[PDB]
């Protein structure tokens, strides 16, 4: 697959957005 495949790199960039909620948890998220 091209998308579903490249979705790994993308989705990955999201996996962070999750852990980011923590770094922002103090930012005033």
Name the residue ranges covered by the structural domains of the chain.
Answer: 1-29
Contact between 12 and 19 under an 8 Å Cβ cutoff? The reply is: no
- Specify the experimental method: NMR
Nearest to 1 by CA among 29, 19, 11, 23: 11
Angle ∠(20,21,26) on CA atoms, nearest 5 = 105
6-25 burial, b at 16+ Cβ within 10 Å, e below that, comes to eeeeeeeeeeeeeeeeeeee
Question: Three-state SS string across 1-29, please?
Answer: CCHHHHHHHHHHHHHHHHHHHHHHHCCCC
């Amino acid at each position: 697959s091209w998308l579903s495949k490249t979705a790994k790199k993308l989705e990955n960039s999201a996996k962070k957005r999750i852990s980011e909620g923590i770094a922002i948890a103090i930012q005033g998220g």
